[PDB]
Design a protein around this ligand. Structure first.
Ligand SMILES: [Ir+4]
Ligand SMILES: [Ir+4]
Ligand SMILES: [Ir+4]
Ligand SMILES: [Ir+4]
Ligand SMILES: [Ir+4]
Ligand SMILES: [Ir+4]
Ligand SMILES: [Ir+4]
Ligand SMILES: [Ir+4]
Ligand SMILES: [Ir+4]
Ligand SMILES: [Ir+4]
Ligand SMILES: [Ir+4]
Ligand SMILES: [Ir+4]
Lengths: 122, 122, 122, 122
């Protein structure tokens, strides 16, 4: 599972998720969004179930990106929540919440939701 | 903001979120849920906008917990996405996605959503 | 439950949700948002569990508003999903998804999520 | 758009969404889930932007189903929020919130979130 997660993945938008799974449940790496207020790589940190149910279930996981790096600050952060499923078409299936830093009038409209599917090719 | 975030926070359910904000946008610490399939502390990792808009906006952030530690494994992970707002009633306002590792029949029913409000007291 | 739901409710933002619960599980009425691209009343339609579990559980429900009326069109619709809980502090607790009509480039950023609490006073 | 919406649609799970779009922004029809605690048809009610932006944008919409009919009561309701996009591969792209009627201890775990893609074939 650690073997399976670690690597470079791509989502349907052409974004690039580069991750290492530590044996202790850690996720570390970089993210590059093909869309939005973003350019180049951004740090990411997250967690996964390092002793997943052996009954052929997926492995639960999450990570976060703060959309600040040396090129831009989009005053925002995305968390993806989902599962890794192994096999020859390996997948990370996620849903995500993007919160954007705001004042307390438009804070009702503070958070976007979506879904990303990450694969090992394309 | 780093000064303001670092500390112990409590949500409306009586859960305990202990966090350190690194100067580089890192969030590290522990989480203890008062509810669900959980006991004691669990590792957490996340990210925040370390150069937030000075126009009195909140600071965007996220973190993840994999619900595995030495006592239990709930085959699941929660990501909270939201903002920190300073002042004398400081708040972290979040929304969250809990994904539970599953087989590919009930995977439509894989993810819970909610909201947590974290304060410095109670 | 039909007795309890029907009426005028207010959310934390000062919005006004006026609803009739039909005996057949129907919800009909009007909504007026205190925020966003909106003014005056808008039609709403929805559904509730008209034979709720008698074990003191809440009653599940949803409704939709298309943000078009004779004054404005915000090219968008909100659905609230949640439960009605009776008693002397009666509550409808919801989460909501607002989708905004878009082209297929920004469609990743198409849907906002939030939560509203509706009460019988204020 | 009214012409385009009205009809029978299918989602990736094999569910059947039968809808009529009234000229006044109404959505009425039936839903049959291929999954979960459900069988046969259930009433649905919803709303759409009946004067959508002509700039080739999608048309915003929502609907609700209370999972009660003459065969079962699943003490729950789903709202789908999303957009209709016309053309020869017409699509309704949605996200959904399923709330399940509960007591006030597990109410933190009250709402599932997902996404459905509806097409005119299969
Ligand atoms: Ir297990
Ligand atoms: Ir999915
Ligand atoms: Ir999709
Ligand atoms: Ir700024
Ligand atoms: Ir909020
Ligand atoms: Ir709340
Ligand atoms: Ir029942
Ligand atoms: Ir709630
Ligand atoms: Ir709240
Ligand atoms: Ir327009
Ligand atoms: Ir989508
Ligand atoms: Ir999908």
């Amino acid at each position: 599972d650690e073997a399976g997660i670690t690597g470079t993945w791509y989502n349907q938008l052409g974004s690039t998720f580069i991750v290492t799974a530590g044996a202790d449940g850690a996720l570390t790496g970089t993210y590059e969004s093909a869309v939005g207020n973003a350019e180049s790589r951004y740090v990411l940190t997250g967690r996964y179930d390092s002793a997943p149910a052996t009954d052929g279930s997926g492995t639960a996981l999450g990570w976060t990106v703060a959309w600040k790096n040396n090129y831009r600050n989009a005053h925002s952060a995305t968390t993806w929540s989902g599962q890794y499923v192994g096999g020859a078409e390996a997948r990370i299936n996620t849903q995500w919440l993007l919160t954007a830093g705001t004042t307390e009038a438009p804070a009702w409209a503070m958070t976007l939701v979506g879904h990303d599917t990450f694969t090992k090719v394309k």
